[PDB]
Amino acid sequence: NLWVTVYYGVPVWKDAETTLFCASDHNVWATHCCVPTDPNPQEIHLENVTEEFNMWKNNMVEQMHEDIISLWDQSLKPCVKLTPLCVTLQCTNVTNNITDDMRGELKNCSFNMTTELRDKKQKVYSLFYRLDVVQINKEYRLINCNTSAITQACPKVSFEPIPIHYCAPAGFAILKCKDKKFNGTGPCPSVSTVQCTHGIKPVVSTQLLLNGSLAEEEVIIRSENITNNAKNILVQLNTPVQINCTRPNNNTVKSIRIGPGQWFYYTGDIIGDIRQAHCNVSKATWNETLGKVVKQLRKHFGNNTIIRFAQSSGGDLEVTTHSFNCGGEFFYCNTSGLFNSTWISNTSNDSITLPCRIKQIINMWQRIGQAMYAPPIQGVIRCVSNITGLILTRDGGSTNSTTETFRPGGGDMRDNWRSELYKYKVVKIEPLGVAPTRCKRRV
Amino acid sequence: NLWVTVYYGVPVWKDAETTLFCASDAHNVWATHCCVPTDPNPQEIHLENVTEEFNMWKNNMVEQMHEDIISLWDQSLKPCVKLTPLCVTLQCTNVTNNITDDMRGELKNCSFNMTTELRDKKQKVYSLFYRLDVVQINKEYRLINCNTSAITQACPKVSFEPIPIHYCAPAGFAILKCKDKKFNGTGPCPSVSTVQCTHGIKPVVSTQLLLNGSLAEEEVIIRSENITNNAKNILVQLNTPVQINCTRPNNNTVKSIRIGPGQWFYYTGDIIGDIRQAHCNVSKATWNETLGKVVKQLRKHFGNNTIIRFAQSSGGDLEVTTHSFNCGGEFFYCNTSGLFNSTWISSNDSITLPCRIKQIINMWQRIGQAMYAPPIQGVIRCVSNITGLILTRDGSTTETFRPGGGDMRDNWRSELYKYKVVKIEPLGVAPTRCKRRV
Amino acid sequence: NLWVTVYYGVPVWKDAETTLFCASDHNVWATHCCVPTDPNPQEIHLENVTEEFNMWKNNMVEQMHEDIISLWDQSLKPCVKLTPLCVTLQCTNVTNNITDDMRGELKNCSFNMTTELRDKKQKVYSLFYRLDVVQINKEYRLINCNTSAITQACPKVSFEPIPIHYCAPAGFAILKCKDKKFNGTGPCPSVSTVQCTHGIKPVVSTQLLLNGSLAEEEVIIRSENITNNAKNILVQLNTPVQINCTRPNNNTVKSIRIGPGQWFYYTGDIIGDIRQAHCNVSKATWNETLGKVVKQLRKHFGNNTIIRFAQSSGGDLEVTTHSFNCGGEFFYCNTSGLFNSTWISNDSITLPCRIKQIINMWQRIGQAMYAPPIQGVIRCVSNITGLILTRDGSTTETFRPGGGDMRDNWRSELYKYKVVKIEPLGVAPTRCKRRV
Amino acid sequence: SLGFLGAAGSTMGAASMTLTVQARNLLSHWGIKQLQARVLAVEHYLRDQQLLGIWGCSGKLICCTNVPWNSSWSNRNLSEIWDNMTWLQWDKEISNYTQIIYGLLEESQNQQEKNEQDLLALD
Amino acid sequence: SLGFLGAAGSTMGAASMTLTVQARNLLSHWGIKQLQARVLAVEHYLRDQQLLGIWGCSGKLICCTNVPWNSSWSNRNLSEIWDNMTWLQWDKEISNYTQIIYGLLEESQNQQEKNEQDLLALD
Amino acid sequence: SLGFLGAAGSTMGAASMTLTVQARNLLSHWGIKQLQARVLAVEHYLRDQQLLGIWGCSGKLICCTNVPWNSSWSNRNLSEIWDNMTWLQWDKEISNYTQIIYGLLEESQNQQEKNEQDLLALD
Ligand SMILES: *[C@@H]1O[C@H](CO)[C@@H](O[C@@H]2O[C@H](CO)[C@@H](O[C@@H]3O[C@H](CO[C@H]4O[C@H](CO)[C@@H](O)[C@H](O)[C@@H]4O)[C@@H](O)[C@H](O[C@H]4O[C@H](CO)[C@@H](O)[C@H](O)[C@@H]4O)[C@@H]3O)[C@H](O)[C@H]2NC(C)=O)[C@H](O)[C@H]1NC(C)=O
Ligand SMILES: *[C@@H]1O[C@H](CO)[C@@H](O[C@@H]2O[C@H](CO)[C@@H](O[C@@H]3O[C@H](CO[C@H]4O[C@H](CO)[C@@H](O)[C@H](O)[C@@H]4O)[C@@H](O)[C@H](O[C@H]4O[C@H](CO)[C@@H](O)[C@H](O)[C@@H]4O)[C@@H]3O)[C@H](O)[C@H]2NC(C)=O)[C@H](O)[C@H]1NC(C)=O
Ligand SMILES: *[C@@H]1O[C@H](CO)[C@@H](O[C@@H]2O[C@H](CO)[C@@H](O)[C@H](O)[C@H]2NC(C)=O)[C@H](O)[C@H]1NC(C)=O
Ligand SMILES: *[C@@H]1O[C@H](CO)[C@@H](O[C@@H]2O[C@H](CO)[C@@H](O)[C@H](O)[C@H]2NC(C)=O)[C@H](O)[C@H]1NC(C)=O
Ligand SMILES: *[C@@H]1O[C@H](CO)[C@@H](O[C@@H]2O[C@H](CO)[C@@H](O)[C@H](O)[C@H]2NC(C)=O)[C@H](O)[C@H]1NC(C)=O
Ligand SMILES: *[C@@H]1O[C@H](CO)[C@@H](O[C@@H]2O[C@H](CO)[C@@H](O)[C@H](O)[C@H]2NC(C)=O)[C@H](O)[C@H]1NC(C)=O
Ligand SMILES: *[C@@H]1O[C@H](CO)[C@@H](O[C@@H]2O[C@H](CO)[C@@H](O)[C@H](O)[C@H]2NC(C)=O)[C@H](O)[C@H]1NC(C)=O
Ligand SMILES: *[C@@H]1O[C@H](CO)[C@@H](O[C@@H]2O[C@H](CO)[C@@H](O)[C@H](O)[C@H]2NC(C)=O)[C@H](O)[C@H]1NC(C)=O
Numbered sequence A: 001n002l003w004v005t006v007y008y009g010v011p012v013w014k015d016a017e018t019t020l021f022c023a024s025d026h027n028v029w030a031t032h033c034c035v036p037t038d039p040n041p042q043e044i045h046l047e048n049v050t051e052e053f054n055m056w057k058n059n060m061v062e063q064m065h066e067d068i069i070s071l072w073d074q075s076l077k078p079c080v081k082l083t084p085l086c087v088t089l090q091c092t093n094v095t096n097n098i099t100d101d102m103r104g105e106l107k108n109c110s111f112n113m114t115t116e117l118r119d120k121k122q123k124v125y126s127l128f129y130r131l132d133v134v135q136i137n138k139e140y141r142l143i144n145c146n147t148s149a150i151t152q153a154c155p156k157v158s159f160e161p162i163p164i165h166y167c168a169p170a171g172f173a174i175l176k177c178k179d180k181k182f183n184g185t186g187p188c189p190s191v192s193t194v195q196c197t198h199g200i201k202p203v204v205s206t207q208l209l210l211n212g213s214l215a216e217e218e219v220i221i222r223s224e225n226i227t228n229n230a231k232n233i234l235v236q237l238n239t240p241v242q243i244n245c246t247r248p249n250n251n252t253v254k255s256i257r258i259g260p261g262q263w264f265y266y267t268g269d270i271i272g273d274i275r276q277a278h279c280n281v282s283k284a285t286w287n288e289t290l291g292k293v294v295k296q297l298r299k300h301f302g303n304n305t306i307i308r309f310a311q312s313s314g315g316d317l318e319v320t321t322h323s324f325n326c327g328g329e330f331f332y333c334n335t336s337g338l339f340n341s342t343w344i345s346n347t348s349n350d351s352i353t354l355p356c357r358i359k360q361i362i363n364m365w366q367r368i369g370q371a372m373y374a375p376p377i378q379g380v381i382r383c384v385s386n387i388t389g390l391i392l393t394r395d396g397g398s399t400n401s402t403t404e405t406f407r408p409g410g411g412d413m414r415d416n417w418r419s420e421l422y423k424y425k426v427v428k429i430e431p432l433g434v435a436p437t438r439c440k441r442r443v
Numbered sequence B: 001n002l003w004v005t006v007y008y009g010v011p012v013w014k015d016a017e018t019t020l021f022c023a024s025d026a027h028n029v030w031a032t033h034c035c036v037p038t039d040p041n042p043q044e045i046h047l048e049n050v051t052e053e054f055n056m057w058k059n060n061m062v063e064q065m066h067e068d069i070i071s072l073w074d075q076s077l078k079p080c081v082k083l084t085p086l087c088v089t090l091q092c093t094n095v096t097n098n099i100t101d102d103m104r105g106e107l108k109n110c111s112f113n114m115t116t117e118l119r120d121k122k123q124k125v126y127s128l129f130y131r132l133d134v135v136q137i138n139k140e141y142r143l144i145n146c147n148t149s150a151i152t153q154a155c156p157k158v159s160f161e162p163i164p165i166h167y168c169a170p171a172g173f174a175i176l177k178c179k180d181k182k183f184n185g186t187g188p189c190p191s192v193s194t195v196q197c198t199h200g201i202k203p204v205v206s207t208q209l210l211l212n213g214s215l216a217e218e219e220v221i222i223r224s225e226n227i228t229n230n231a232k233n234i235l236v237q238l239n240t241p242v243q244i245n246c247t248r249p250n251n252n253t254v255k256s257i258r259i260g261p262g263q264w265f266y267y268t269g270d271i272i273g274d275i276r277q278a279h280c281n282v283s284k285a286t287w288n289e290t291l292g293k294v295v296k297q298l299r300k301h302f303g304n305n306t307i308i309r310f311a312q313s314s315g316g317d318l319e320v321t322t323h324s325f326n327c328g329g330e331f332f333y334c335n336t337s338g339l340f341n342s343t344w345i346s347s348n349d350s351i352t353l354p355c356r357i358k359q360i361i362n363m364w365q366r367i368g369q370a371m372y373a374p375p376i377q378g379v380i381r382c383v384s385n386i387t388g389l390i391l392t393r394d395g396s397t398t399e400t401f402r403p404g405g406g407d408m409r410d411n412w413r414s415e416l417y418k419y420k421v422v423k424i425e426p427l428g429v430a431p432t433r434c435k436r437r438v
Numbered sequence C: 001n002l003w004v005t006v007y008y009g010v011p012v013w014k015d016a017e018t019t020l021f022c023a024s025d026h027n028v029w030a031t032h033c034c035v036p037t038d039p040n041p042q043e044i045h046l047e048n049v050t051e052e053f054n055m056w057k058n059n060m061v062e063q064m065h066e067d068i069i070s071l072w073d074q075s076l077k078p079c080v081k082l083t084p085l086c087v088t089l090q091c092t093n094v095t096n097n098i099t100d101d102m103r104g105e106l107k108n109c110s111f112n113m114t115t116e117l118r119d120k121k122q123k124v125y126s127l128f129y130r131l132d133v134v135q136i137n138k139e140y141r142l143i144n145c146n147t148s149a150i151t152q153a154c155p156k157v158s159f160e161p162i163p164i165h166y167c168a169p170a171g172f173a174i175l176k177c178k179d180k181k182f183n184g185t186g187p188c189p190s191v192s193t194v195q196c197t198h199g200i201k202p203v204v205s206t207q208l209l210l211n212g213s214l215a216e217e218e219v220i221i222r223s224e225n226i227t228n229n230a231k232n233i234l235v236q237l238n239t240p241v242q243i244n245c246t247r248p249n250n251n252t253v254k255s256i257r258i259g260p261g262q263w264f265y266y267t268g269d270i271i272g273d274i275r276q277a278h279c280n281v282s283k284a285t286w287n288e289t290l291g292k293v294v295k296q297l298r299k300h301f302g303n304n305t306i307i308r309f310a311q312s313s314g315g316d317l318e319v320t321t322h323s324f325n326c327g328g329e330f331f332y333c334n335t336s337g338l339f340n341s342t343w344i345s346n347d348s349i350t351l352p353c354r355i356k357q358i359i360n361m362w363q364r365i366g367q368a369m370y371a372p373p374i375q376g377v378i379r380c381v382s383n384i385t386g387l388i389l390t391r392d393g394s395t396t397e398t399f400r401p402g403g404g405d406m407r408d409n410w411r412s413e414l415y416k417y418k419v420v421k422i423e424p425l426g427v428a429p430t431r432c433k434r435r436v
Numbered sequence D, E, F: 001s002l003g004f005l006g007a008a009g010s011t012m013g014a015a016s017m018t019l020t021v022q023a024r025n026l027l028s029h030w031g032i033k034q035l036q037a038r039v040l041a042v043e044h045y046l047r048d049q050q051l052l053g054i055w056g057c058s059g060k061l062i063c064c065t066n067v068p069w070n071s072s073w074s075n076r077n078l079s080e081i082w083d084n085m086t087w088l089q090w091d092k093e094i095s096n097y098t099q100i101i102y103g104l105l106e107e108s109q110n111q112q113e114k115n116e117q118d119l120l121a122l123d
């Protein structure tokens, strides 16, 4: 009675992986390589479509990670190679205009540097932070001398994140989850289709996520497996917490040639008092923020469980401190004042000051062999940013006791991406299909 | 009572920007092995009753030619020796043993400590330099590029001689050519034709006069974007070549030293015979006829009662103020004040232009990328055709014109003005009396 | 009253040249760069199809040559450049543990090398194999100092040949010759179609072909023009000859830092007696194998003709000896002991071997590789699956080991394959007209 | 005016009226990633077009054929398939049998290419 | 033959007879510029073929449709359009309304296909 | 069945029953070689499809046309051509007339389209 009928243009799809390209809208995200965005993007709501999403198996995150690494390397590749700099340094402490915190923190080094002419040498003196310099035996070397070569970042290229929109190729589409309070691993009752993602700023940080999206309704706790003590917890905040970071010291930047066409930048001197870099977090706002986080953690851990916050257990600064790029400088802030409380049964203009260290020799993305020198920046630096989420680890104490402990985590950049790319998945469009009908083909 | 009918294969087009590829034909820096040789039989289709508008001043074929030339130039040097060991203190004295006044103080004799094949050994060598490449430090000199760039030696086996390049449109595109002998580069062209590839264009690099290009068929043609605006250059296409003979009379002996494993540096060792300046010869009468023709055409835009005066360039880099070109592989900088010194009012006698020579070349007006042109052994003579001029008009009853130039895109426009690229749009619609039967 | 009828999907092909890609199922051949292959490749037998093959005009060979060289270079690009080593060396002989065979073979060289800090120098003392060191006039330099730069091969990358499968693009097909006793030039009565070739191991060797395919039934002698003394003869064996190659010396490998994260590897010392490297084959197996070769040569040159074998007449070590990569070391073995005989109508043969660390592969100039020494003692076991012979330019023919052109090793495996393009569209007459 | 895939989730008999909307949007080192993506869009498009070609459905969004429907693949009623169901659900229910059906569609068209040629020869 | 664009400048009537010539000349870091040129030519070809397919004009150079001509778009006499004007001129005059006509063509074909399916089901 | 090109060597008649076997396999610095391979396959595929389209054989495997067969191309009996010869042999035999035949096919279809347009306008 019934016959096979072939249809083309059928609105169906399959989970799929493909390569996405950037659309943008003097940086390290090749925004000049990217195409421009669509001024009028078309978001189509799909009525009566329930789609299952899994943010932990989302390969968009893996593709973003790789793209960021490659873009980074390409922007650095053509810049000055500071191999003439791995020399014996003669260093003493800065004692003039020093406060108590900056005691032995900053060092005054001198060395024999090359010049344009192969035949000549110059004696250069620069200030360095103690984190960049390691003692040889007053004889010091830079920390990278026994593991890597240094490339000076180009002074003309910024490190300020520029939103990146990822776009699917024709034949593919990106499904977006609009379900508020979506925990990122589950069926999503309300979805829409987009061709490009919203603009995601590739902000790099460790313990606290900065300048991301806010939760629509309430703090959202997400993890790959909540009962697994080995997993990280991503917390998306409902309201931002404003954090004010600064390096008060007025740096005078000097530049010399170290070979034909090769300019090296260094801190020459500091004008006035030498003080420690720091970040200020409103005390009241931070206290409200944690109370909200605790109420939500209890949905998984119970009322009878005490929720305790504690500082990181230890390791390299890159995993024990809050790292970020502020004004182009690299800060390592100790967030102990933010995670030092016990909440039992959920129990002005004050502020929390976090001391920060400054480091010029940078080893990003947890790689070995590619090290960067961050030129110093002339003048005084201040930046203001939003804390939009936290990364926490868990010591599973409640198994044996009444108290559970959470500590700042992070350090794996993929988890910072997952923060924004949890609403999206890539699907392939499959326009062909068949179904029985009453229709037959005349011969 | 009419119906919509769809036609595919409709002979229409739209102006469009696309990427062209080179075909050229069947070692040299132009990397013609990177092009796909074209069909020995070209085709050209005259389009009868078609008038189309051309605008040579807004033509992206020029921009592509520029970018590809810069790119190949740089690619050619990638595998060549980097002469970083030469940025040393040089201890120099004057070359005075066999000099005429023509080059008094121009050549220098420099000694220095050069690297060798082994890391632990040095050698003392000496070589001759042309002054323009060497600057005083405080008898202590350094090469001109030491405080701005590295120098890559051009590979001695690779020729700089221009090879005609044919630029071809991708399928779906076509190149329209203007056949109007009097066309000045802008506006409607009453007679056009279609080609897939351009004629071969030689990427000749020169700064004031245009060498080895196309000649105009009937009259001297003055072309400009806006002739009124003295901020613009004027391109002049000639009806006769003016033959120019250029030479470096000195017989140079070239030596080579090892500077590192697998690497060597080439330099002038000595000069055989007397030392005289390089120069170019232009027949006076031919030049005077040619210039008079230029003046007549200029009067058509400035008035019959306006005096036209020619003058030498007032200032700028040597690359801009002199006529710079590559002769036999050497880089000459010729003073053209002998050609542009005349006021025009309503028997083997030649003009001689002295020329200086440089070895450290910074091309395409860039900074940070210098090339060392190795010397060529022997005596050099080259003969070329002046096919056009680049002139600049100054800001009364007299107008003044001076040699202009410095922007390479102008040399290209002089060959590419005849062409524009269009996209073919084969799908069209028109009313007919044909109703589909269903 | 016949009309042209157009057929699409017609089983017709033309000889063609296209780009082939690899599908190869920490290694120099970068198999991670190849696509994964078909777990169970298909083959279609073309019953009643005879096709011509010509192995000497097979451009698959030329592409394999280019791919192999490019892969080689790509693996060396990211490795340390050993330019600080091109110094004057102060060298003495290693005479402490020599048998008479090793007298003057190894040298103990001392030099001032750079270190992590630009400011400091270190004294280094390493052992060299002589062939890599040339006297300057006890002052020596490394052989490559006047012509090339040295790149140290990365210690983490294996040179072991791994099978590479070549695959045609859609629209193309590879025909395979299944005939036994096929010499590579002419009609092949039994053919089949495949999309990918079998895997071919890119084995580099110079006189004997190692680890290739064996002839199905008998020794096959192939050449472009057998009567032309300018051509090489490729002999495929139907039985392997097993060869055991050893470097008996126990090397202790040392390393130093020469720059910012850069390190150099070298032999520090040797434990126990030093002996020359050598290779063993059984005399009987070799004599049977050679006799089979002689019989087939006799078919081509005539009966009651003397067939003589002789050692290579001269040239560079790379062509006068049998070179190969054994465990990562580069051996240069003297095959005169295999090819010293005249043929007319438990006990092994030992071949002395030399070792080099500075390698100029693919007959190139300016790009030289330094092979890090390998710690310990090395033994390799491999199969001789063919020979490369030349014929000396009377009543006696003389054959000598040949080689030096890598294309010949490739041809010995690719002779069975041909690339064609598919031409699916065509016409023929038939009694059919189109209704109007 | 639902937009691309705006009909997804809608009844199969309703969604089938917007096929044009999806069909017209199928053709819609850093430059290599773009170049590869452009190539894939073309390859996927052409593979589907080739199937329509060999099945005799070239140039049509809706194509009826002469392969009968087998109750084995599905024994659902038309009022249960074309109504009270969407295309995503249908695709899952008969996913197994897709390869079988495609093989039959090809066999049928090849037989009808031959039958047509024979009739013309007889004319 | 007048050559590839030789018909340009002739009247629309005259030029309609050379469509084969123009149609057959479509489709026929340095390696990237060459690949981009090749990919682009393919994409443009396919995009136009897709429109013809959607409109029901599949594999044809000239197609009559069921969309009536609107005098609003142009009210020229057919003798003027076909005997005085060339295609370049025509296209400029109706550069506007191109997307109206295309939208109507897509709609007309969709309706025709639906109606054919119903007749076949009834028969 | 026989598999790809398994019909080579079979008679033309027998081989013609496997056309879909071959048709489905026509379509399906380092990474550039891979792109070139993909692009080239597409270009060849499309050029053949374009040509069939021009001839009025779009979407068909066996397309009858109205160009008569000339004895100057080949004067064999049909039984010889279809029962004894294979396609490889046939292709060699008439290689010299390929372009002639193709030119005639393009001309014939252009005339057929003109005739259809006039008849519809006359109705
Ligand atoms: C979270 O998001 C916030 C924004 O919402 C980010 O904060 C911004 O950070 C950038 C980069 O540090 C700031 O931009 C810089 O401002 C300097 C100060 O001058 C400003 O104000 C004067 C007076 O009104 C204006 O005249 C001037 O134009 C500026 O608007 C400038 O001196 C800087 O320019 C110099 O450096 C750049 C380096 O890229 C060079 O390209 C320039 O040529 C020049 O040499 C620069 O413009 C910006 O002002 C901050 N915004 C706010 C609101 O404070 C946070 O950084 C981000 N968080 C994280 C972790 O990234
Ligand atoms: C405008 O156009 C003219 C051409 O009309 C250009 O002038 C030519 O310039 C090239 C160099 O760039 C000259 O080429 C050289 O000629 C030397 C002499 O050639 C004679 O002898 C050879 C046989 O040995 C004959 O075949 C030839 O016809 C002559 O009788 C050669 O010795 C040179 O070869 C050597 O140097 C090159 C360097 O690249 C190496 O590659 C070679 O292997 C070899 O070592 C070379 O061929 C040419 O002769 C000039 N022609 C004329 C008529 O003068 C102008 O330069 C051009 N204008 C501009 C601005 O570019
Ligand atoms: C996010 O929310 C979903 C929905 O409540 C949780 O999904 C449940 O997971 C368990 C364990 O695998 C299953 O047995 C249930 O059937 C799932 N529920 C539903 C409705 O399907 C998910 O585990 C939550 N994730 C986190 C990290 O909390
Ligand atoms: C972070 O810095 C901002 C300024 O950039 C502070 O906001 C100001 O607070 C004063 C309070 O007297 C108001 O008068 C200003 O109008 C505010 N300025 C702006 C732009 O809002 C903020 O309080 C600081 N926060 C912390 C934690 O230090
Ligand atoms: C050619 O250049 C002249 C000079 O810039 C242009 O004329 C000027 O036009 C502006 C208005 O845009 C007036 O304010 C100036 O006073 C004019 N100057 C002179 C000398 O006339 C002229 O329009 C340009 N022509 C073209 C075709 O570009
Ligand atoms: C440039 O050189 C050419 C020769 O290369 C000169 O042409 C010669 O002119 C003289 C004039 O008496 C004749 O005797 C020669 O026979 C000519 N030679 C040729 C090749 O025909 C030309 O005059 C020179 N021009 C200038 C101004 O230097
Ligand atoms: C390989 O075998 C082919 C035959 O399959 C030999 O080719 C013949 O060579 C003779 C002598 O030149 C010719 O007269 C025949 O006409 C050739 N036959 C064919 C089919 O081409 C070839 O010489 C052999 N080559 C070797 C090295 O053994
Ligand atoms: C999503 O489901 C709802 C509920 O079935 C659909 O709403 C019905 O639509 C039909 C057709 O327009 C109306 O006749 C009914 O009266 C509607 N039902 C109700 C309760 O209002 C809706 O159309 C579906 N969405 C999509 C995109 O198909």
Ligand SMILES: *[C@@H]1O[C@H](CO)[C@@H](O)[C@H](O)[C@H]1NC(C)=O
Binding pocket: A091, A092, A093, A103, A104
């Ligand atoms: C620098 O300060 C540290 C503080 O612990 C002290 O031990 C060290 O001796 C000081 N060095 C100099 C040169 O004053």
Ligand SMILES: *[C@@H]1O[C@H](CO)[C@@H](O)[C@H](O)[C@H]1NC(C)=O
Binding pocket: A096, A097, A098, A272, A273
């Ligand atoms: C800092 O240096 C200034 C001179 O520039 C001097 O007047 C001042 O007293 C110093 N302050 C301290 C704390 O050393």
Ligand SMILES: *[C@@H]1O[C@H](CO)[C@@H](O)[C@H](O)[C@H]1NC(C)=O
Binding pocket: A284, A287, A288, A291, A346, A347
């Ligand atoms: C933090 O908030 C809780 C209520 O959520 C309140 O009981 C507690 O006193 C607050 N702590 C501070 C320091 O304000």
Ligand SMILES: *[C@@H]1O[C@H](CO)[C@@H](O)[C@H](O)[C@H]1NC(C)=O
Binding pocket: C088, C090, C110, C111, C112, C123
């Ligand atoms: C190392 O350098 C010194 C000079 O500083 C020299 O006397 C000595 O011979 C050199 N040693 C070697 C092994 O080259």
Ligand SMILES: *[C@@H]1O[C@H](CO)[C@@H](O)[C@H](O)[C@H]1NC(C)=O
Binding pocket: B047, B048, B049, E006, E007, E008, E009, E010, E011, E014
């Ligand atoms: C150009 O117009 C003339 C009439 O003046 C006509 O004869 C000729 O055929 C036209 N050319 C073309 C290409 O149609």
